[PDB]
Design an enzyme around this catalytic site. Structure first.
Site, short mmCIF file in Angstrom:
data_model
loop_
_atom_site.label_atom_id
_atom_site.label_comp_id
_atom_site.label_asym_id
_atom_site.label_seq_id
_atom_site.Cartn_x
_atom_site.Cartn_y
_atom_site.Cartn_z
N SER A 243 0.74 -1.07 0.15
CA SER A 243 0.12 0.14 -0.02
C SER A 243 0.49 0.87 -0.11
N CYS B 143 -6.91 -7.04 3.48
CA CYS B 143 -7.91 -6.31 3.32
C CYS B 143 -9.13 -6.07 2.61
N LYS C 257 -9.93 -10.97 2.56
CA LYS C 257 -10.88 -10.61 4.16
C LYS C 257 -12.22 -9.42 3.57
N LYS C 258 -12.08 -9.06 3.50
CA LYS C 258 -13.90 -8.34 3.00
C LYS C 258 -14.18 -9.87 2.00
N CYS D 158 -2.30 -5.74 1.87
CA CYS D 158 -4.16 -5.97 2.25
C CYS D 158 -5.10 -6.13 1.00
N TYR E 253 -8.96 -7.03 15.86
CA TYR E 253 -9.27 -6.26 15.68
C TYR E 253 -9.25 -8.21 14.10
N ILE E 254 -7.89 -8.19 13.78
CA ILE E 254 -7.93 -9.54 12.91
C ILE E 254 -8.75 -10.82 13.72
N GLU F 74 -12.43 -11.10 13.19
CA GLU F 74 -13.09 -10.82 11.82
C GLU F 74 -12.89 -12.16 11.77
N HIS G 274 -34.43 8.98 6.61
CA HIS G 274 -35.34 7.41 6.89
C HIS G 274 -35.90 7.06 5.93
N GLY H 14 -0.41 -10.66 16.77
CA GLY H 14 0.51 -9.31 16.78
C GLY H 14 1.10 -9.64 15.58
N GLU I 169 -29.35 7.55 10.74
CA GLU I 169 -30.24 8.48 11.17
C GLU I 169 -30.11 8.60 12.89
C1 LIG Z 1 -5.64 -10.07 8.15
C2 LIG Z 1 -5.61 -8.69 7.71
C3 LIG Z 1 -6.34 -7.93 7.50
C4 LIG Z 1 -7.08 -6.52 7.70
N1 LIG Z 1 -7.74 -5.88 7.32
C5 LIG Z 1 -7.05 -4.46 7.11
C6 LIG Z 1 -8.71 -2.71 6.18
O1 LIG Z 1 -8.90 -4.28 6.60
N2 LIG Z 1 -8.37 -2.32 6.21
C7 LIG Z 1 -7.09 -1.71 6.83
O2 LIG Z 1 -7.41 -0.36 6.33
N3 LIG Z 1 -5.60 -2.92 6.89
C8 LIG Z 1 -5.97 -3.33 6.90
N4 LIG Z 1 -4.84 -4.65 7.10
C9 LIG Z 1 -3.66 -3.54 6.93
C10 LIG Z 1 -2.54 -3.31 6.22
O3 LIG Z 1 -3.18 -4.54 5.17
C11 LIG Z 1 -1.64 -2.90 6.06
O4 LIG Z 1 -1.31 -1.63 7.41
C12 LIG Z 1 -1.37 -2.42 5.12
O5 LIG Z 1 -0.89 -3.73 4.09
C13 LIG Z 1 0.33 -1.62 5.15
O6 LIG Z 1 1.27 -1.76 3.88
P1 LIG Z 1 2.51 -1.23 3.04
O7 LIG Z 1 2.40 -0.84 2.17
O8 LIG Z 1 3.13 -0.66 4.93
O9 LIG Z 1 3.16 -2.97 3.73
P2 LIG Z 1 2.36 -4.20 2.36
O10 LIG Z 1 1.76 -3.89 2.48
O11 LIG Z 1 2.96 -5.45 4.20
O12 LIG Z 1 3.62 -4.09 2.00
C14 LIG Z 1 5.27 -5.22 1.64
C15 LIG Z 1 5.89 -5.21 0.97
O13 LIG Z 1 7.50 -4.40 0.51
C16 LIG Z 1 7.62 -6.91 0.39
N5 LIG Z 1 9.45 -6.56 0.31
C17 LIG Z 1 9.79 -6.27 2.49
N6 LIG Z 1 10.93 -6.34 2.02
C18 LIG Z 1 11.05 -5.91 0.22
C19 LIG Z 1 12.62 -5.78 0.60
N7 LIG Z 1 14.13 -5.88 0.85
N8 LIG Z 1 12.27 -6.31 -1.02
C20 LIG Z 1 11.77 -5.38 -1.81
N9 LIG Z 1 10.29 -5.65 -1.73
C21 LIG Z 1 10.74 -6.66 0.01
C22 LIG Z 1 6.88 -7.55 1.02
O14 LIG Z 1 7.56 -8.31 -0.01
C23 LIG Z 1 5.68 -6.52 0.59
O15 LIG Z 1 4.62 -6.99 -0.57
C24 LIG Z 1 -5.13 -5.91 7.02
C25 LIG Z 1 -3.83 -6.92 7.69
C26 LIG Z 1 -4.84 -7.81 7.99
C27 LIG Z 1 -3.01 -8.86 7.78
C1 LIG Z 2 -44.95 4.69 -0.72
C2 LIG Z 2 -43.87 5.47 -0.36
C3 LIG Z 2 -42.58 5.29 0.89
C4 LIG Z 2 -42.29 6.22 1.16
N1 LIG Z 2 -41.07 6.41 2.04
C5 LIG Z 2 -40.16 7.09 2.50
C6 LIG Z 2 -38.73 6.70 2.70
O1 LIG Z 2 -38.21 6.09 2.47
N2 LIG Z 2 -37.94 8.04 3.75
C7 LIG Z 2 -39.13 9.84 3.50
O2 LIG Z 2 -38.19 10.47 3.90
N3 LIG Z 2 -40.15 9.53 3.61
C8 LIG Z 2 -40.92 8.63 3.03
N4 LIG Z 2 -41.88 8.73 2.41
C9 LIG Z 2 -42.95 10.00 3.33
C10 LIG Z 2 -43.64 9.38 3.55
O3 LIG Z 2 -44.74 8.73 4.38
C11 LIG Z 2 -44.56 11.41 4.69
O4 LIG Z 2 -43.51 12.13 3.81
C12 LIG Z 2 -44.83 11.23 5.94
O5 LIG Z 2 -45.63 10.62 6.22
C13 LIG Z 2 -45.72 12.76 6.20
O6 LIG Z 2 -45.95 12.94 7.28
P1 LIG Z 2 -47.98 13.23 7.55
O7 LIG Z 2 -47.35 13.93 9.35
O8 LIG Z 2 -47.54 14.46 6.84
O9 LIG Z 2 -47.91 12.38 7.34
P2 LIG Z 2 -48.97 11.33 7.39
O10 LIG Z 2 -48.10 10.53 7.81
O11 LIG Z 2 -49.69 11.07 6.57
O12 LIG Z 2 -49.59 11.38 8.58
C14 LIG Z 2 -51.68 12.18 8.82
C15 LIG Z 2 -52.44 11.31 9.58
O13 LIG Z 2 -53.50 12.04 9.67
C16 LIG Z 2 -54.67 11.27 9.70
N5 LIG Z 2 -55.53 12.39 9.66
C17 LIG Z 2 -56.15 12.64 8.18
N6 LIG Z 2 -57.35 13.94 8.99
C18 LIG Z 2 -57.36 13.05 10.03
C19 LIG Z 2 -58.40 14.03 10.85
N7 LIG Z 2 -59.41 15.28 10.32
N8 LIG Z 2 -58.56 13.99 12.07
C20 LIG Z 2 -58.14 13.26 12.03
N9 LIG Z 2 -56.99 12.55 11.58
C21 LIG Z 2 -56.71 12.83 9.77
C22 LIG Z 2 -54.62 10.21 8.91
O14 LIG Z 2 -55.22 9.50 9.29
C23 LIG Z 2 -53.02 9.98 8.92
O15 LIG Z 2 -52.29 9.28 10.01
C24 LIG Z 2 -43.29 7.71 1.81
C25 LIG Z 2 -44.54 7.75 1.52
C26 LIG Z 2 -44.90 6.81 0.39
C27 LIG Z 2 -46.43 6.65 0.01
CL LIG Z 3 -2.73 -9.41 14.66
#
Ligand SMILES: Cc1cc2nc3c(=O)[nH]c(=O)nc-3n(C[C@H](O)[C@H](O)[C@H](O)COP(=O)(O)OP(=O)(O)OC[C@H]3O[C@@H](n4cnc5c(N)ncnc54)[C@H](O)[C@@H]3O)c2cc1C
Ligand SMILES: Cc1cc2nc3c(=O)[nH]c(=O)nc-3n(C[C@H](O)[C@H](O)[C@H](O)COP(=O)(O)OP(=O)(O)OC[C@H]3O[C@@H](n4cnc5c(N)ncnc54)[C@H](O)[C@@H]3O)c2cc1C
Ligand SMILES: [Cl-]
Ligand SMILES: Cc1cc2nc3c(=O)[nH]c(=O)nc-3n(C[C@H](O)[C@H](O)[C@H](O)CO)c2cc1C
Ligand SMILES: [Cl-]
Ligand SMILES: [Cl-]
Ligand SMILES: [Cl-]
Ligand SMILES: [Cl-]
Ligand SMILES: [Cl-]
Ligand SMILES: [Cl-]
Ligand SMILES: [Cl-]
Lengths: 450, 451
Positions: free
Chosen positions: A14, A47, A50-51, A42, A177-178, A181, A439, A262, A444
């Site tokens: 890396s 990384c 592993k992923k 990596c 973490y290793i 995971e 939402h 380690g 959120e």
């Molecule tokens: C199982 C595991 C999971 C990980 N998961 C994550 C993760 O999810 N997210 C994350 O951010 N990090 C993760 N890491 C850490 C990440 O892999 C390392 O921090 C990163 O690879 C370090 O990069 P580097 O370049 O320092 O070393 P390296 O990637 O090890 O590179 C060093 C290289 O130098 C070479 N080398 C050594 N000596 C010589 C030489 N004399 N001449 C030529 N080549 C040489 C080696 O062969 C090697 O290829 C994980 C590590 C492990 C072991």
């Molecule tokens: C299919 C679908 C998917 C959606 N997905 C999302 C989403 O992913 N994310 C998002 O942020 N928004 C989403 N929305 C929008 C969200 O549902 C609305 O913006 C939100 O419900 C509006 O709230 P409100 O209070 O204005 O109205 P409503 O939630 O419709 O509430 C009005 C209420 O007032 C009542 N009412 C009406 N008149 C009277 C009365 N005279 N007396 C008593 N009760 C009364 C009704 O019965 C009702 O329960 C989605 C909407 C739909 C239709």
């Molecule tokens: Cl370790």
């Protein structure tokens, strides 16, 4: 005869790929050495695969747990691990081909061999000397095996990617973490999975309220967690199974044992000792905020500098270094603070900034106020396997600045990136409150807490 | 014979009414809420919630029918029990109703499950009893409408979609808004041969054309068959009970169910709004100012009935801010209706906040607008034979490249937008995005790594 370049990158991971390509974009003549496969950890053993296996686990949970409550039934279910691995490897093979085309377009020179230092500004690759006034050490790290009798019968995360079938019984030893995971993926794919941690809870650096949800869900569905566990020895029976002996007298028989205790930096085998580069107290290459080593003309980026072992940190630090060295950006450097992370646990954990505990240690208990919301993810709410979600904000001071944002639950993996931008910009609870919710989504709940 | 006084009467128990009633009660007001149908309104019973539950069923169908095979899973004799999915969906909605009752008990809201009718500007009649209050909120929502053509009675609204007990073998969906696009995608994923009819050139005309073009191209390769420039002239019920749509151009399309999703109208009739003096605006909605005040002092209109923006979170925030203004003395409290984010549960999902490229160029001029894009394949589909495209776009304005619009289409986009919506509310620039470290591997990291 020594061949000169403007930049020599040791390691095609890396850090190296990112820094090499950005340097080439700014007219530098770049040489990149890679002793194994392009993409480093990596792409080949981290990384990416592993992923892919995590998505395999999410499909396994759909078929074996959730599909029935959505009205879908079927029979003769079968799982072909080799097909998932072949599709996983085909995807990685396309990432390799993509990097090569990129190198052909930007003119980066690559040598798929081991680079060894001769001195501070010269390396030997395949018996040829190369020199540059700028050399990037981007060698990464490697998994650690414990000094326990029978530890060699176990495998590391590298070994997890070499498996060709789901083990009937798997032991995972580790609390990072290793470990979490891999234990979740094996459990989802049908292995009887046992997770062993040495202390009281896993993921000790993450917010305790968040990890407690993970621990409770593991006790309900997930792998069996063993806390306060220390492995005494591992015996290989003549029937090929492994017996784990714990210091407390307990024992578990398994088919595979994964050590995830380690990683350590790749510092030996390439004459680093001939450069004069110094290590810090942690045992990593010592660097300044600009990735400069103790030797002028030598930089250290990625896992080998020990700052934050994440791919995006290695990528950004390497690009910002190339900007500094080859695009005249003198002050360019990476901010290692507030980097977001996502753990592909079950359920998924997303985090950016300070846990409540860390905020209390840095700002004091009176200054810290947390907001949290618990709910069931709608996806699981219509089923007989309801899964909890927990989203938490850690705020400080009278303006309630958001210093931490954490979540656990379905879909949290894709929620964090946008919030990490707001926290980088200094968001307050008022900024969150002034943002209208989307939402219905789990995201959120982050902007509707009171 | 006696009129009962309240501090606040809320007509309607949907998103706007519940939010405004609960917030007013938290501030010490004596509140009465009338709901003539089910608590939760459109959102809980016939909108956001049942729609999302059916969308999850569609995602599960896509896993079983398209992606499981490439992840190494095989199975036989697949069966789909629509009545079981519907039963679980309605049991979830019943639990949501009970959560709202629990909240009214905690906050102290009085509720009557009957229809409220105005007697005059400050008095309503509910179940034969008169109630008066100096503050009355009209939160009556809207309703689906049928086109005025021969055979329109053979079609069903979105309400009828939720009343379905089985997947129709063939379904026509007529409409070009988010409801038609979402229901066509769900019907197609659940196995119905679906046809989508739009009067113009493309659906979701108000959304960024770059994003919608990816949706239209995906429908052509796999999704519902889109019919453009289509006007339904009449619907005929055949002797076999199937329906034939006759288009104005003469084309005939035979289906089993026809869903009308051509628009909703506000609930203005049946509750004697004509005895209050409240006026309508030239769009046919209750006229209001920025503070949700109707033309009559002491009467307010929040949610779909005021026609400003038909989203649940908008109804909720406006209703809450109104109660902050009337009962917590927040004189200038009002909702900002601009930069409200939306997610459309199309296939793939669309997420959008702020201005489309076209809208930005119209307000600031091409000279001041610069867009960024990232085109890639979601890793989830990339290992399979059914690769799905993703496209993310940033619309920037001026030298500081202020993010005035953020839009995406692709697997997982539904959960990515909320956080970016906070960043855009705070005035983010491309520099703020560039300075945020990415999360790998995720689709969301593509929003912060564009060049
Ligand atoms: C199982 C595991 C999971 C990980 N998961 C994550 C993760 O999810 N997210 C994350 O951010 N990090 C993760 N890491 C850490 C990440 O892999 C390392 O921090 C990163 O690879 C370090 O990069 P580097 O370049 O320092 O070393 P390296 O990637 O090890 O590179 C060093 C290289 O130098 C070479 N080398 C050594 N000596 C010589 C030489 N004399 N001449 C030529 N080549 C040489 C080696 O062969 C090697 O290829 C994980 C590590 C492990 C072991
Ligand atoms: C299919 C679908 C998917 C959606 N997905 C999302 C989403 O992913 N994310 C998002 O942020 N928004 C989403 N929305 C929008 C969200 O549902 C609305 O913006 C939100 O419900 C509006 O709230 P409100 O209070 O204005 O109205 P409503 O939630 O419709 O509430 C009005 C209420 O007032 C009542 N009412 C009406 N008149 C009277 C009365 N005279 N007396 C008593 N009760 C009364 C009704 O019965 C009702 O329960 C989605 C909407 C739909 C239709
Ligand atoms: Cl370790
Ligand atoms: C004259 C008239 C009377 C109505 N009476 C009721 C009623 O008693 N209960 C109710 O829930 N809705 C009532 N409605 C509204 C209607 O049932 C429903 O809200 C539709 O959304 C309106 O088309 C009435 C509408 C009208 C025009
Ligand atoms: Cl790169
Ligand atoms: Cl940890
Ligand atoms: Cl904590
Ligand atoms: Cl529930
Ligand atoms: Cl509420
Ligand atoms: Cl209907
Ligand atoms: Cl509509």
């Amino acid at each position: 005869m020594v061949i000169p370049y403007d930049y020599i990158v040791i390691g095609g991971g890396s850090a190296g790929i990112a820094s090499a390509n950005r340097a080439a974009m700014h007219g530098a003549k770049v040489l990149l050495a890679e002793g194994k496969e392009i993409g480093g950890t990596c792409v080949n053993l981290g990384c990416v695969p592993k992923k892919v296996m995590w998505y395999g686990a999410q499909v396994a949970d759909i078929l074996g747990t959730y599909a029935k409550d959505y009205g879908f039934d079927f029979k003769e279910k079968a799982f072909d691990f080799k097909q998932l691995k072949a599709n996983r490897q085909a995807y990685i093979d396309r990432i390799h081909a993509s990097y090569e085309r990129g190198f052909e377009q930007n003119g980066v020179d690559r040598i798929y061999d081991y680079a060894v230092f001769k001195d501070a500004h010269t390396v030997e690759i395949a018996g040829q000397l190369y020199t540059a006034p700028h050399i990037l050490i981007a060698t990464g790290g490697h998994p650690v095996f414990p000094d326990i009798e029978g530890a060699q019968y176990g495998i590391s995360s590298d070994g997890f990617f070499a498996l060709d079938e789901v083990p009937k019984r798997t032991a995972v030893v580790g609390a990072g973490y290793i470990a979490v995971e891999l234990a979740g993926v094996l459990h989802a794919l049908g292995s009887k999975t046992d997770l062993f941690i040495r202390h009281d809870r896993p993921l000790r650096s993450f917010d305790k309220t968040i990890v407690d949800v993970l621990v409770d869900e593991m006790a309900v569905n997930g792998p069996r967690l063993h806390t306060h566990a220390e492995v005494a020895k591992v015996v290989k029976n003549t029937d090929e199974s492994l017996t784990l002996y714990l210091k407390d007298g307990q024992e578990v028989e398994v088919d595979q044992l994964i050590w995830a205790i380690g990683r350590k930096p790749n510092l030996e085998g390439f004459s680093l000792d001939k450069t004069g580069v110094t290590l810090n107290d942690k045992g990593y290459i010592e660097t300044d905020a600009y990735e400069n080593t103790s030797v002028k003309g030598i930089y250290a980026v990625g896992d080998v500098n020990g700052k934050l072992a994440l791919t995006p940190v290695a990528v950004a630090a390497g690009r910002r270094l190339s900007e500094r060295l080859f695009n005249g950006k003198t002050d360019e450097k990476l901010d290692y603070q507030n980097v977001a992370t996502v753990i592909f646990s079950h359920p998924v954990i997303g985090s950016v900034g300070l846990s409540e505990e860390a905020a209390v240690k840095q700002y004091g208990q009176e200054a810290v106020k947390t907001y949290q919301s618990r709910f069931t993810s709608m996806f699981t709410a219509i089923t007989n396997h309801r899964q909890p979600c927990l989203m938490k904000l850690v705020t400080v001071g009278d303006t309630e600045k958001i210093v931490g944002l954490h979540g656990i639950g379905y879909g949290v993996d894709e929620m964090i990136q946008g919030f990490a931008v707001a926290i980088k910009m200094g968001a307050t609870k008022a900024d969150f409150d002034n943002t209208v919710a989307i939402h219905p989504t789990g995201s959120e709940e982050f902007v509707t807490m009171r």
